[PDB]
């Protein structure tokens, strides 16, 4: 716990130098910058490719997902009364023998 | 072997012709005392490294100083080596085995 | 008795606690000391053990001042001082005991920090001479087994003893070297 | 009798072995192809090379050291016992190594040692730790003969380590477990004694148990008492050469200890100037660029009056344990104070430790594997 | 290691006193019992091997590797970058 | 202690043959004198000693006790007092008795020689009786009690005769500085009283002290006496238990065959178990130098340690007492104090050593140099300035574990994995 104003000297502890070097020379490289803004505005076109392929697909999951959504109410429920049902049948079968 | 070449000039006998017979041997032995000047000494005295030879003249030492390319300095001994080539400390530099001990320890 | 142990225990357990510890013994002025320790509430000593507790607080921090509190008005109270003439010999042989081993509570935590000692500085503040304060640190650095070099002539200490991480690194050296050795006995218990 | 019934038939059965080993080896490939097929182990073809090593070498000193005119053994088992087995190709295994280290061990009791470089050369098949181990051994006792004690030091220390990883285990050291304890502990102890201000790896090589006891040895050899020359040469000598069996001990033969003159004052000639090289170097080096009140003050230290302080003196730089100058107008001594290095030990063991993790985190999955 | 100190000496330290109290009774008395010679081993706890340590403490001796091993790695990445970025 | 409980009952009533008187009003150091007049008593008479005092200092009054013995000889006792110019008329008693015991005599030693020529024990045991009788009258007739107890100790009534008679024999063959016969005494006295008789302390404590005697002196190798006597009634710095008892030079004895003969490992040992002890805390309050040799030196003081230990040194050679490694001694009492005060030093100046100890710093160079030659110390001299310097503060103890924490582990696995 402080009990002043935050003013800090710089100093030197695990990991400074490796994030630093991480993220102070990226910045430099995203503030000016005439080599980044076209990569990222083709970036941007394959993220706008992505989600082209993806409306395709989306239309596709309404009619898949829709079915694995409504069957898996019925069918996963299905078989954990499975599992849940097997005690009774594990206890009046083994009742059986004696 | 335990370097008492003082000793040793004034340990031959002269008679046995046999030491006389092999060639090359009375110059031999003073070229390995040369040697082991160069690797312990960075300086020696003209009259010293004469004794050392046998109790060299002063013309018979212009070989032995030409030999190793020594020669005379200020005053007035015989150049054999620099303080600092002569030394050669491979002491405390270690802890620098970063690569291999990371190489190691990668997984 | 009490009082007696303190100075005994209390370098002891600064000693232990600067990772001295497999010394740590119950059923002693420790264990004493630590039923009247646990009170979350204790402002003012009102009790004779409260002022034993009190002036064991002092004792920690280091500072003289906090002896001297028990010493006089719990022994005024509570009439452990008014019952000896020999009280009057009695106050020097605890006080200057306390200045010692408050310097040497003071010294157990301290000397990391350290990287040389004005030792004149010593025997003006907690209150001793120098051909004590010599002998005192003479003895300390011998059988302490410090990593100190003592210029007894220059009046100078030069120790620069490290390290802060230290205390965990020794602390899990100990956690590791306390595993081959019970091991041992339960190697020596099956076979 | 019954001494030299057990001596005869081991000899008499390596030399009709010895036949069988130069035939199998070099041409008939079936007959080693049928070897490789019918057992479960060629632990056992193998382990009958190297068996036949120390147990030959005993059997050849004994009759060395019995007959020592008019030389049977030494000749015969040096041309035909040796060499017909070594020098021909190699069989297709780890025995052409065995038979190498077997030659090396051979090689290594006569005191004839200048092929230990083509030793070395023709040592291609892998260094597996059994192989490795076993050529540090001699490699290392090779380097102590060569008077490079700052090398032969290094080589002792890990053979000694006992993580090498080794695991054995079917009796590939038996009966002599303790004299690879016992020989490098030993062997180590004389090289100390030479040059060390410098090892601080000495903890590495022996434990504090030997360390205690032969630190010490050190300081009372070269200090104040040459009682050490003896003690320490008393062990030295079997461990030095390493001569197999010394035979029975009896005065109505003599026959023995005339072999045992030459073997051991040949290593008396050793230790002798060795040590007395050390107590030079013994006294700390305490100011590294010594003025008039040093020099002489080590002069007043290297001995008395009057004749011939000085010469001594500049006798024994020269070895190889000081490297210095001498100024003329000065009258100044300056020289030279080397030191060594602190840990070297944690990096080593880092590898070490994960092998004590590694081969605890493998057994109990081999019992882990049994008990499920 | 004070839970398998404490199992250890009932597995083999007490069966060290009580066998060779066995010995005193001499392993057979025909006429009558044999009260003492029956009343030795009489059940301490464990008998050997205390699972809840032996299976879920060995879970969390594998979470406790995981966590040395993932504290130790972050600290790998810094004393390459350290070195290495000031070596320029 | 043990023994203690019945010494509590005695209070102190021990058993001296001149009973209680020495030398009167002296004038040099005292806790020297102390011991004198200790062992005048505790020794049968001493002899040398009367004149050992009267060296340095002239008394008159050695001439009582000088009076008072006769079995050094009468007739030495009989000059001294006549020297001192002292009418002594009536000294006709000595003439009459120690004549009328050569007519005794003349029996003794003709049955003497004649049975032990036969070889034949009764005309030999009559012969120890009538002849055990007689050297204790005058012991000069002085080789006679070396002959007498040759043969045969063991007289009609062993333990309580023999006993008396050995120390009788023992006391007066210091006396004739016959120091043969003495240490012949040294094997047999010490062994009869091994062999104790009630175990009373009025015996045992006066045993005990008359093992302190023949070490006092110095013949050969009493230092190993020291190591004998010192496992003898074990590890007390006086062997008698309530603290009336005072010897001062049985510790600094003790202390120069410690030192000058051995390690001092060893010195530790002693300033645990001998320096600090029931009786010896008694003995702090008295005896100047053997208390600034130890007090000094343990509480690590150096100012005053090293000056009051060099003080001590001029009190050592006034010592005329039997000693025989007197200078050991003050050499040693330099070499140890600096050992231990340089041994967690910084920098110590040579100049300022040799302003104190009273040499030459030259001196004190090549003797700090032999003391690091013999490395008890690791120090290393800044040649300069003429100071020595101590610098280990020896960090990272780390490793020291790390190494056999796992190679222990790695081989005691291998006893499981066995089976």
Redesign the interface.
């Given at each position: 716990g402080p009990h002043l104003q935050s003013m800090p000297s710089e100093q030197?502890r695990?990991?400074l130098?490796?994030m630093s070097?991480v993220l102070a020379k990226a910045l430099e490289v995203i503030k000016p910058a005439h080599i980044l803004q076209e990569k990222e505005e083709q970036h941007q076109l394959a993220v706008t490719a992505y989600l082209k392929n993806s409306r395709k697909e989306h239309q596709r999951i309404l009619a898949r997902r829709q079915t694995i959504e409504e069957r898996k109410e019925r069918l996963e429920s299905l078989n954990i009364q499975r599992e849940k049902e097997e005690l009774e049948q594990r206890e009046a079968e083994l009742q059986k023998v004696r | 072997e335990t370097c008492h070449f003082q000793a040793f000039w004034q340990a031959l006998d002269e008679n046995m012709d046999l030491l006389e017979g092999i060639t090359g041997f009375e110059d031999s032995v003073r070229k390995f005392i040369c040697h082991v000047v160069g690797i312990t000494y960075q300086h020696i005295d003209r009259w010293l490294l004469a004794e050392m030879l046998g109790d060299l003249t002063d013309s018979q030492l212009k070989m032995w100083m030409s030999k190793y390319g020594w020669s005379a300095d200020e005053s007035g001994q015989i150049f054999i080596c620099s303080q600092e080539e002569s030394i050669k400390p491979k002491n405390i530099v270690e802890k620098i085995d970063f690569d291999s001990v990371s190489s190691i320890m990668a997984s | 008795y009490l009082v007696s142990a303190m100075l005994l225990e209390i370098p002891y357990m600064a000693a232990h606690e600067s990772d001295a510890r497999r010394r740590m013994i119950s059923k002693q002025f420790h264990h004493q000391l630590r039923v009247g320790e646990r009170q979350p509430l204790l402002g003012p000593p009102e009790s004779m053990r409260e002022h034993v507790v009190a002036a064991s607080k002092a004792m920690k921090m280091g500072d003289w001042k906090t002896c001297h509190s028990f010493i006089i008005n719990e022994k005024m109270n509570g009439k452990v001082w008014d019952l000896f003439p020999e009280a009057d010999k009695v106050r020097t042989m605890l006080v200057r005991k306390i200045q010692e081993e408050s310097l040497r509570t003071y010294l157990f935590t301290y000397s990391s920090v350290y990287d040389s000692i004005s030792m004149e500085t010593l025997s003006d503040m907690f209150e001793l001479d120098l051909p004590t304060v010599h002998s005192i640190i003479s003895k300390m650095i011998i059988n302490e087994e410090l990593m100190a070099s003592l210029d007894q002539p220059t009046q100078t200490v030069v120790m620069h003893r490290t390290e802060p991480t230290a205390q965990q690194n020794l602390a899990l050296q100990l956690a590791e070297k306390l595993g081959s050795l019970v091991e041992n006995n339960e190697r020596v218990f099956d076979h | 009798q019954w001494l030299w019934d057990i001596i005869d038939e081991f000899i008499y059965q390596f030399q009709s072995f010895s036949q069988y080993r130069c035939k199998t080896a070099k041409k008939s490939e079936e007959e080693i192809d049928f070897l490789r097929s019918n057992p479960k182990i060629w632990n056992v073809h193998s382990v009958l090379n190297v068996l036949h090593s120390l147990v030959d070498k005993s059997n050849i000193n004994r009759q060395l050291e019995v007959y020592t005119s008019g030389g049977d053994p030494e000749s015969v088992a040096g041309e035909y016992g040796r060499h017909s087995l070594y020098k021909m190709l190699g069989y297709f295994s780890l025995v052409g190594l065995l038979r190498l280290h077997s030659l090396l061990g051979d090689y290594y009791q006569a005191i004839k040692v200048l092929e230990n470089i083509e030793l070395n050369k023709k040592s291609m098949y892998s260094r597996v730790p059994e192989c490795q181990v076993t050529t540090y051994y001699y490699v290392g006792f090779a380097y102590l003969m060569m008077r490079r004690y700052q090398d032969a030091i290094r080589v002792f220390a890990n053979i000694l380590l006992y993580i090498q990883r080794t695991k054995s285990m079917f009796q590939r050291t038996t009966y002599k477990y303790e004299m690879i304890n016992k020989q490098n502990e030993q062997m180590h102890a004389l090289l100390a004694i030479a040059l060390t201000m410098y090892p601080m790896r000495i903890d590495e090589s022996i434990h504090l148990q030997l360390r205690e006891k032969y630190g010490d040895k050190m300081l009372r050899m070269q200090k104040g008492d040459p009682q050490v020359y003896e003690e320490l040469f008393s062990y030295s000598c079997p461990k030095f050469l390493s001569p197999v069996v010394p035979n029975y001990d009896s005065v109505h033969p003599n026959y023995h200890k005339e072999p045992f003159l030459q073997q051991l004052k040949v290593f008396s000639d050793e230790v002798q100037q060795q040590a007395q090289l050390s107590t030079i170097r013994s006294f700390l080096k305490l100011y590294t660029t010594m003025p008039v009140a040093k020099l002489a003050g080590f002069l007043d230290l290297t001995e008395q009056e009057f004749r011939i302080q000085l010469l001594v003196f500049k006798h024994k730089m020269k070895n190889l344990v000081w490297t210095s100058g001498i100024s003329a107008l000065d009258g100044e001594f300056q020289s030279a104070s080397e030191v060594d290095f602190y840990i070297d030990k944690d990096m080593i063991h880092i590898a070490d430790t994960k092998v004590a993790r590694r081969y605890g985190d493998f057994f109990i999955r081999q019992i882990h594997k049994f008990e499920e | 290691r004070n839970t398998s100190k404490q199992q250890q000496q009932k597995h083999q330290y007490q069966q060290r006193r009580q066998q060779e109290n066995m010995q005193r009774q001499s392993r057979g008395e025909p006429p009558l019992p044999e009260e003492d010679l029956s009343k030795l081993f009489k059940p301490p706890q464990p008998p050997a091997r205390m699972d809840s340590l032996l299976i879920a403490g060995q879970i969390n001796t594998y979470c406790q590797n995981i966590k040395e091993f993932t504290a130790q790695n972050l600290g790998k990445l810094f004393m390459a970058q350290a070195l290495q970025e000031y070596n320029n | 202690y043990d023994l203690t409980t019945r010494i509590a009952h005695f209070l102190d009533r021990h058993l001296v043959f001149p009973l209680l008187e020495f030398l009167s009003v002296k004038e040099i150091y005292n806790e020297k004198e102390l011991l004198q007049g200790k062992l005048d008593l505790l020794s049968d008479t001493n002899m040398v000693d009367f004149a050992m005092d009267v060296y340095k200092n002239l008394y008159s009054d050695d001439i009582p006790h000088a009076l008072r013995e006769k079995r050094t000889t009468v007739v030495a006792q009989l000059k001294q007092l006549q020297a001192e110019t002292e009418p002594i008329v009536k000294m006709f008693e000595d003439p009459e008795t120690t004549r009328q015991m050569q007519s005794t005599r003349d029996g003794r030693m003709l049955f003497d020689y004649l049975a032990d020529k036969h070889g034949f024990r009764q005309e030999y045991l009559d012969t120890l009786y009538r002849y055990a009788k007689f050297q204790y009258e005058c012991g000069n007739y002085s080789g006679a009690a070396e002959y007498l107890y040759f043969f045969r100790v063991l007289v009609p009534a062993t333990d309580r005769n023999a006993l008396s008679s050995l120390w009788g024999k023992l006391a007066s063959e210091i006396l004739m500085q016959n120091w043969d016969a003495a240490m012949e005494d040294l094997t047999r006295l010490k062994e009869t009283i091994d062999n104790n008789s009630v175990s009373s302390p009025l015996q045992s404590l006066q045993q005990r002290t008359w093992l302190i005697h023949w070490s006092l002196f110095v013949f050969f190798n009493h230092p190993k006496g020291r190591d004998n006597i010192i496992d003898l009634f074990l590890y007390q710095p006086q062997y008698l238990n309530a603290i009336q008892t005072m010897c001062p030079h049985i510790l600094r004895y003790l202390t120069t065959a410690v030192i000058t003969n051995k390690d001092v490992r060893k010195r530790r040992q002693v300033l645990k178990d001998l320096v600090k002890v029931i009786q010896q805390e008694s003995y702090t309050y008295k005896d100047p130098i053997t208390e600034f040799v130890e007090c000094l030196y343990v509480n690590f003081d150096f100012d005053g340690a090293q000056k009051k230990l060099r003080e001590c040194e001029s009190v050592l050679v006034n010592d005329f007492f039997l000693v025989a490694c007197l200078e050991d001694f003050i050499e040693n009492a330099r070499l140890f104090i600096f050992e231990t005060f340089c041994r967690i030093h910084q920098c110590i100046s040579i100049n300022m050593l040799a302003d104190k100890l009273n040499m030459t710093p030259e001196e004190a160079e090549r003797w700090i140099v032999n003391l690091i030659r013999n490395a008890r110390l690791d120090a290393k001299i800044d040649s300069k300035l003429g100071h020595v310097v101590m610098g280990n503060n020896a960090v990272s103890p780390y490793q020291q574990v790390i190494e056999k924490t796992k190679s222990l582990s790695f081989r005691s696995q291998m006893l499981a994995m066995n089976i």
């Open positions: 030197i695990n990991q130098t490796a070097s | - | - | - | - | -």
